[PDB]
Amino acid sequence: CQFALKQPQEKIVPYVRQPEEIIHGRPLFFATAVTFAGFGVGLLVESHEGRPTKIEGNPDHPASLGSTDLITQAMILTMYDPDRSQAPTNAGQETTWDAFVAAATAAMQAQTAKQGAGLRVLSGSLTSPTLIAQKQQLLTQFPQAKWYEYEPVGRDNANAGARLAFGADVHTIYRLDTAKVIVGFDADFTAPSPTGVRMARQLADGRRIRKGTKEVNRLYLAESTPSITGLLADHRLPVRSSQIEHLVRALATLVGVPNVAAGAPLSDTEKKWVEAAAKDLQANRGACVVLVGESQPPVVHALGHAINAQLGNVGSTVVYTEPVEDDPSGGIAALSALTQEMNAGTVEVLLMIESNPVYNAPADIPFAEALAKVPLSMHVGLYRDETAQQSVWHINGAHFLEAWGDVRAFDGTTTIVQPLIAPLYNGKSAIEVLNVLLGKPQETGYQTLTAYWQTQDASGNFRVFWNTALHDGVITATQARSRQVTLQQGFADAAPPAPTQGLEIVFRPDPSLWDGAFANNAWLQETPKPYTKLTWDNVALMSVRTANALGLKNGDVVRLTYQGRSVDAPVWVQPGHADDSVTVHFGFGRTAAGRVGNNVGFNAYRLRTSATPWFGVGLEVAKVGENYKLASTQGHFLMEGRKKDLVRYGTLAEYVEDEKFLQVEKEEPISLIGEYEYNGYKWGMSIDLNVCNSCNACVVACQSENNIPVVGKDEVWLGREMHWIRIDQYYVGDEHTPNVYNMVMLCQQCEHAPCEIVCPVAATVHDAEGLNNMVYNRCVGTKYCSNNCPYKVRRFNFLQYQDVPYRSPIDASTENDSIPVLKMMRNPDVTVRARGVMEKCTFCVQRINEARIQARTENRRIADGEIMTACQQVCPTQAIVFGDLNDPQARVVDLKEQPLKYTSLDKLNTKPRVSYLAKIKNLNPDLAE
């Protein structure tokens, strides 16, 4: 309880030399990009003065068409993490940066005496052309130096399948805008992948269902575990993850592949799925695609290129370009070829660009014991990772908002990573650390970036070319050239072995925490996982029929014993799952993540075996626990007959006969309160629930925009998560093969808002614009608004929820004292809320007002695209559409007169401003029985 008669003397400081570009109070968006796996996502990040506070999508970029992922959006709390490495560290104790360049250059003259032998580098799968040119300068200065590229969710099997079918390595850019059916095969392509935002928009562009739409996408999936593409899949099949090599061998023989050598037969529901998915592939040959993700072996990846070359997709929707990444034939096998080189000496310098392989290595690859045999182990990462303690040297990371850099996206388009801010802690990025190893330690990150692009610009007037590349983000004088391929024959001749009986393990990246590189990010942790709405826990995902054979409920801790290792995993049962196919997720069990990701789940990387790195069948469950915490944030995953109010679901077979078949043509409701007249800037929202894949990028972008506090695991289990927007799975149907439906439930901004009439101090009123104003400074904390809110989209600050993964919220010793580096990530237009006030989705009223007030100074009206909320500017599928309702030529006034426009809880006369477009899941005639 802070208390004073006056607020203290607030100092206002100007600059000392104010730069020309900065106007105090204006957002000043900068066009950068983020190296996610090795590829760029393409960003438009908002730097108010120097500090970037909100990552948005670069609409010029090919990967993100103006909308980012869940992980890509929450790179701001990773930037302003107080657990970031604030100083370099030599053998445990802190040090300077120039002590490193006196120790590294003293070890670089000892390597030139040899042929640069012990100079192994362990970067992760980089595509950026400046670090490729610095590597190719490093590997021509030191001849016998090796560059190994380890990535745990790398495209190892995806490139080994491109070698096994085409000869050389080829990059495969799929194109779903000309695609009628998308027969995936263990391919979560709408996930946080290097192309996950474009493959989600192109998949959702095909199924924008309007007044005159008769043909949409189909999306046969056959997924191991329920993955977020399965929300958009209309024929998702729970396959055991070991039969997907045999579903493709049953589908490559229905289409024309001569040497498929099919084996290991199918079940009666996997065979009638594959005789109908391939029947819809033999038709519409020009617009169809067979997808396969890196969970699969390299043979089926080669068969996925065999089917796509049989159906004539090459040149139409599956283009083949030169490989954008530098070393495509190096993955887990490149990490295993390094530790067998790291053993018994014969390595002297080991640079480790941000990989964290002490934590990420498979159990068959002894990277822990092979490390500390290197006399000089250097590590470059923005966290003191699991490796940085076990490394001799350690450098800061220079997170991409702090560092001058490049990155190449898929399609080959290079985008320059400008620093929006100077390095808070002197970061010294990967382009600046190789400058020390090459011999140019005083050369900055900008001096070696323009030194490369001056030589890769064959046009004159480089300053026009360079300033345009920083402005637009993209370059597009550098796209990957389309490669003519062969599709060699005789690659799947060897018959597969017997399908081994036994309970299967399935390795996955968590959609929140991909490979544990961002496990210290608080926004990604408390963001609910897509199907199983959990926050701070790795789980073992079982089917309802698998757990019934083993006899374990939704909270027991089991000791998953793989080939030699046990992991002591909790259990979350899951209806969409495959039989005997227990799924564990990466990204957890970090022992040196920081204060957010330390000991949150079980480390699934201790079960990888580097020969079965994604799935294996030798698992023993052996329950050893009971009643784990498992802080979930949904309460009931089962639509309880509340259809017509949550997710109205239909098929396209019944929509082509009746347009408004999910609407209820009912009489106008009677209200005794009358109504009000909204005549200027009527704000409404249309959420297309048919295209929402539950990517949770809108949950974490409301968090980054509206200063929403993270809440720890102990207070999520009490149902006190602060999330203004939530996605609701609902699991309609059979408990073994259900349909999972998303309802993006935010504050519906009800016109006859029942949450407002129950506010004693009137801390919740309306605009004349029409949206619901939750004023935080007036809230005395009587949680009656939350009780009368029928959707329960009100979210109360219970404790002082502020910097909660860095100080536990059950104290008042640091209640009114805040972390100084976390204050820069906050939006300066949203109230950072106190201990006892309630929150609510305010339609991003700080984005409404900042363009309503700006349109009043220049005497005009707001257009449609001038106001774009944070959940709308992030949705890769563009499910959310915000806009004026009194503007007749608007985009939301079209989407709210569609025959699928329904409002949630119209049984109550709340009259919401948020209407939902209903879900239509395009069932085949040969499979709907």
Binding site: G719, E721, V758, G781, S786, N787, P790, F796
Partner: protein
């Protein structure tokens, strides 16, 4: 009771310091023991004024000896109650914002919420409970003053009772200010625990939006309340020898009204 009060004042000193979220209230169910016990304590003191006010309309004489053990039992079930609308708020230092006062903000309370009327009901219920029990103690503490024979306890009851003397010009003015007060506290407590009943029934919730909440809550207030007067007066006959004033016909009639409620 001091160890209960030091459990009361420590749970409140915890509640203000760390927050309102040491209770266990979730975001679905955001009203819990702070409101279940608040409507319970408000419910207890209501039959303490059926005994004090509603039965005085009926000119009934069995309410006479049950009077002060129900007038005072109302007040202490309101002082225990009325803290709960002041401490269940997350920012309890601004519960004056629920009062219609003029400020340098142009803001006033809402006066459509049934928790703002809870301010208006209880701060009328708390003040006329202590004005109808103090008016009843004006002619009674004049009798404890004259039976004192000790001037420092005579001056205590000679100032609590303002100087009363009896008198027909004061006795007639007493009962025409008592039965009007007993006629003003009878639509009050049928309204107070109806107004502590509207702050569920105003809300659109399925178990809350029923319209027989206003007479069924006040029925449960004169059900739970008569149970507390019975639970308190059975140990006030066996411990203070009041077998000739709290005779068992008073429990035969307090049981009939508790049954009829």
């Amino acid at each position: 009771a001091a160890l209960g009060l030091l459990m009361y004042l420590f749970s409140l000193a915890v509640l203000f310091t760390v927050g309102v979220g040491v209770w266990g209230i979730n975001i679905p169910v955001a009203w819990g023991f702070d409101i279940i016990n608040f409507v319970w304590w408000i419910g207890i003191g209501h039959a303490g004024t059926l005994i004090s006010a509603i039965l005085l309309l009926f000119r009934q004489d069995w309410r006479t000896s049950i009077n002060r053990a129900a007038e005072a039992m109302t007040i202490f079930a309101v002082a225990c109650a009325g803290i709960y609308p002041l401490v269940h708020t997350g920012r309890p230092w601004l519960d004056y914002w629920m009062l219609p006062y003029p400020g340098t903000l142009g803001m006033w309370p809402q006066f459509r919420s049934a928790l703002e009327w809870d301010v208006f009901a209880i701060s009328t219920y708390a003040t006329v409970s202590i004005l109808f029990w103090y008016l009843g103690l004006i002619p009674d503490l004049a009798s404890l003053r004259d039976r004192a024979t000790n001037i420092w306890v005579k001056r205590f009851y000679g100032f609590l009772a303002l100087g009363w003397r009896g008198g027909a010009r004061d006795w007639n003015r007493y009962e025409v200010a008592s039965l009007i007060l007993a006629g003003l506290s009878t639509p009050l407590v049928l309204s107070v625990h109806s107004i502590i009943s509207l702050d569920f029934a105003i809300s659109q919730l399925p178990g809350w939006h029923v319209t027989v909440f206003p007479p069924y809550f006040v029925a449960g207030a004169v059900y739970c309340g008569f149970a507390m007067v019975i639970l308190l007066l059975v140990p006030l006959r066996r411990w203070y020898k009041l077998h000739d004033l709290i005779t068992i016909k008073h429990f035969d009639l307090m049981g009939k009204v508790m049954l009829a409620s």
